Amino acid sequence: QIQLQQSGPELVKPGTSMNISCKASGYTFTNYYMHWVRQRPGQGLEWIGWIYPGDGNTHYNEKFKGKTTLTADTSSITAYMLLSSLTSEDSAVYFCARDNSYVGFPYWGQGTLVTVSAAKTTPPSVYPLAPGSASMVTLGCLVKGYFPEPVTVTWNSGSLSSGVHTFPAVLQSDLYTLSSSVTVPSSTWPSDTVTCNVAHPASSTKVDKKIVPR
Amino acid sequence: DIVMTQSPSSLTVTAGERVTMSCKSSQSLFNSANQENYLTWYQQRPGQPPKLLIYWASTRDSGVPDRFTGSGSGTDFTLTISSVQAEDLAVYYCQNDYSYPLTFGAGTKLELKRADAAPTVSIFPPSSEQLTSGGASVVCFLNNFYPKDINVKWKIEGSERQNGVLNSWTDQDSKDSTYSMSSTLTLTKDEYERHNSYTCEATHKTSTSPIVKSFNRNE
């Protein structure tokens, strides 16, 4: 039951500093190294460094040593990484990863998406996609005009997962627009309720839009 | 810097066939003292953290199927999947775990090959909530097709519209290996109500005739 739970996505301005967390549960926090890995959008993985929470010992990749500080708090079994003097190149997903006594990283956090931008945080407008009035039927939700990434879309709070397609967002108008598709038996709609659950964690916004017929 | 070179950049294979991807290190990862190769393989599905596949170049981690096999020594390493499943679609990374800094390869993207499939097309008018926004989005879903290449044309009363259209493809489906794409035509409320008939045309290699879905404002 190892769990590395990282802090939520954050929008930070260029030249500022950002602290991200990784709460490590299910094991002795002071007996294992905690590594950090960066993955820029669409790019590969880069190793940042590690910390040994048992004594504060650290070792950094020289590429990140100038602007990265790793700390750990044993009382709260939480590891921290301070990224300072952030640039647009630093926009990436940051993972925390625990190693094992073999080599490699068997346990990973979910990753924290950091967007370095001067734009403002904008929650999305969620619009229902219902078929025009004129076997099975496809519905959808339009998640338009948000910043920054990401958003999560579920249907009926996870019940409708088969036949669900969520399309990657595209950046236009300095904002992201995303759509998600769901196809259910035609006998179940509008007989039963179909609802999209949109969450924009960088804005702490959640929307539950019910798809009603026209 | 130990540079890790992975080849090829991407694979394409039919379900059930065998693939082998290569990882080469600019310096030896072989420890002559204990006769071990400090080489690790990872599998990363879209939107998820990397998952540990094989360590010590050839030792599989707990719960990894036996179809995954790592081989090689020194500077030449391979990852073999004896019978690729639809769920095996991912980017596979090798990692130097021998000397600092720890370094990863650029990854090898495993894509799947399957029978051609025509898309299912659905068109959706702007919602009444978005019409109060002063904007109007016309969305067209093209679900579960193969191959990935597909064309979408928008028509407003029979006249083609070029820009204002944004398309987005899903990742390959992890169980049926199909693709889906969305096409969104965004206009202002005034320009949308200036017209009546909106048409989304999908032309895929599975047919010489386009699949055409239409919506009229006065339906």
Author numbering:
A (entry chain H): 1 to 101, 103 to 135, 140 to 219
B (entry chain L): 1 to 219
Study text:
The murine monoclonal OKT9 was among the first antibodies shown to recognize hTfR1 in several cell lines and have its activity explored in a variety of contexts. We now demonstrate that OKT9 is a potential blocker of cell entry by clade B NWMs, as it engages an epitope on the apical domain of hTfR1 that is a shared binding site for clade B NWM glycoproteins. With nanomolar affinity for hTfR1, the OKT9 antigen binding fragment (OKT9-Fab) sterically blocks clade B NWM-GP1s and reduces infectivity of an attenuated strain of Junin virus. Knowledge that OKT9 blocks the GP1-TfR1 interaction through steric occlusion presents a mechanistic platform for the development of broadly active competitive inhibitors of NWHF that target viral entry mediated by hTfR1.
A crystal structure of OKT9-Fab was determined to 2.0-Å resolution by microfocal X-ray diffraction. The molecule crystallized with space group P21212 with a single molecule in the asymmetric unit. Sequences for the variable light and heavy chains, determined by sequencing of their genomic loci from the OKT9 hybridoma cell line, were used as guides during model building and data refinement. The overall structure of OKT9-Fab resembles a canonical murine IgG1 variable region. All three complementary determining regions (CDRs) in the heavy and light chains were resolved. Their sequences were identified as CDRL1 QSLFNSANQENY (27-38), CDRL2 WAS, CDRL3 QNDYSYPLT, CDRH1 GYTFTNYY, CDRH2 IYPGDGNT (51-58), and CDRH3 ARDNSGYVGFPY (97-108). The constant heavy-chain region spanning from A136 to T139 showed poor density that precluded building during refinement and remained unbuilt in the final structure. Of greatest relevance was missing density for residue Y103 in CDR 3 of the heavy chain. Its side chain could not be placed during refinement and was omitted from our deposited structure but was included in subsequent computational analyses. Averaging across four biolayer cycles produced an equilibrium dissociation constant of 4.8 nM for the interaction between OKT9-Fab and hTfR1.
